From a paper:
The atRA isomer binds exclusively to RARs whereas the 9-cis form of RA binds to both RARs and RXRs, (each of which exists as three isoforms α, β and γ). A general model of RAR/RXR-mediated transcription proposes that unliganded RAR/RXR heterodimers are bound to regulatory elements of their target genes and interact with transcriptional repressor complexes such as NCOR/SMRT/SIN3 to recruit histone deacetylases that lead to repression of target gene transcription. Binding of agonist ligand to the nuclear receptor, triggers a conformational change in the ligand binding domain (LBD) with the repositioning of the C-terminal helix H12 creating a binding surface that allow coactivator to bind. As such, RAR/RXR is a non-permissive heterodimer in which RAR agonists can autonomously activate transcription while full responses to rexinoids occur only in the presence of RAR agonist ligands.
Author numbering:
A (entry chain A): 230 to 250, 265 to 461
B (entry chain B): 177 to 415
C (entry chain I): 1471 to 1481
Write the structure that this text describes.
Amino acid sequence: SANEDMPVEKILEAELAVEPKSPNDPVTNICQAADKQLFTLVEWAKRIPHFSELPLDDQVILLRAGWNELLIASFSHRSIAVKDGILLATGLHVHRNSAHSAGVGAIFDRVLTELVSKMRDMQMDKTELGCLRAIVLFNPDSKGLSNPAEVEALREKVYASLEAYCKHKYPEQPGRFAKLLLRLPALRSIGLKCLEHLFFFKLIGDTPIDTFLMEMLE
Amino acid sequence: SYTLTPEVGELIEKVRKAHQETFPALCQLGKYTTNNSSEQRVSLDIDLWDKFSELSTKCIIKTVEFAKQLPGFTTLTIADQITLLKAACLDILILRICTRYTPEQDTMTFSDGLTLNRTQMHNAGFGPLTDLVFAFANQLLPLEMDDAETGLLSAICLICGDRQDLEQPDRVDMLQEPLLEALKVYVRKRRPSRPHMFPKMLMKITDLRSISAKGAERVITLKMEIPGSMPPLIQEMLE
Amino acid sequence: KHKILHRLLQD
Ligand SMILES: CCCOc1cc2c(cc1\C(C)=C/C=C/C(C)=C/C(=O)O)C(C)(C)CCC2(C)C
Ligand SMILES: CC1=C(/C=C/C(C)=C/C=C/C(C)=C/C(=O)O)C(C)(C)CCC1
């Protein structure tokens, strides 16, 4: 069947298997929590049906392409019951006014209003979140993919399972499947801006921490 | 099965009528091109920018005409109607122009029939976005979208409760629901063997938004490059 | 502002 091709039960296990259990500035805390969840992200991808069956090079590419949106989606949903803030995988909180002081209030507000709040106001469950992250994972448009065709197929499998799950658990809401998919735009947009911030972090090849000059004299 | 409810069917027809009447199809159009600046890429060609800025102003006027015919839109507050149009303007213009793409000659055709190649498109004002827009237009063809689907998709982008500075977002959400439903059943009533066309078609909005976001920035760089100012309507819309 | 826009919307 549709669910027997990409079971929402399996995906839920992947989501739960990666769920974890304030001195420095907000940004450094976010980076601290980000690094932690990067260690686990691979183990999550493997727990996603049919992911390990892909070429190792395509797995790398997919993870390289969506690691940011994947993580943002997680802590966003994790921060449902929190008011004007987010809960980090480290257990630490980052409140709205804190983010602003660190100079990232604009994008942090987008996350609160466009991700966290929307997730809360529709009562998105872990399973639906797992499917959305799985959809983001199987991104056929990724540059360098050897076989974009199989990836498109995996995503479309997740489409069917999710839609089937919604009809199954929310019969009174015919357009829940679409209401969920319409969260991806914001996630994609927020993800990009997020990367714009850490542009200098990505492209690095000089000498950080000013160790250049320290040696230039001795 | 995919039976078409009269209530849905009527909605679908309103939207198609709205799109057709405010945006002629590529085929039902006599075409014409020019000679100037079709050779090499350039920062900006004034003659072309002028012609292109005029057509843009007119298509924005048409875009509003398209919006006003949509169920419930007129019954929104003026502030909300204006907030929606300004937010979705580029989304709709890009989606529209991308349905005027002829692969063989690698050209885009405007509403006056003017047909420009990729290079002229770049010199007209698109510039850095030229390759993104043409790529997107190429990603659309496999969808074999008709006037109704192109219309619904446009209305869905327009009627978005997820816009900042709205005063009645929930009411905008309710307005979008039927549009999303009508699209789902219509897309599949035409391609019963492939149900995945609905989500795939819907997900093209994600990509559209990103190209549109780049568009807002291009308006800023153009405002710097161009001699005069932006046409008043463009300015009211994207600034 | 939106002078023109208001005109188009008031029709
Ligand atoms: C990686 C180095 C920059 O990573 C980020 C930086 C930022 C953000 C996200 C990330 C990412 C990509 C992931 C965060 C993951 C977390 C925090 C997971 C968790 O705790 O479970 C948001 C919060 C969107 C805005 C503020 C800044 C710009 C600081
Ligand atoms: C508005 C505008 C831009 C986008 C142009 C588009 C996408 C409009 C499409 C026109 C049509 C489709 C007219 C017609 O049908 O005749 C760019 C980004 C260059 C910045 C300058 C002003």
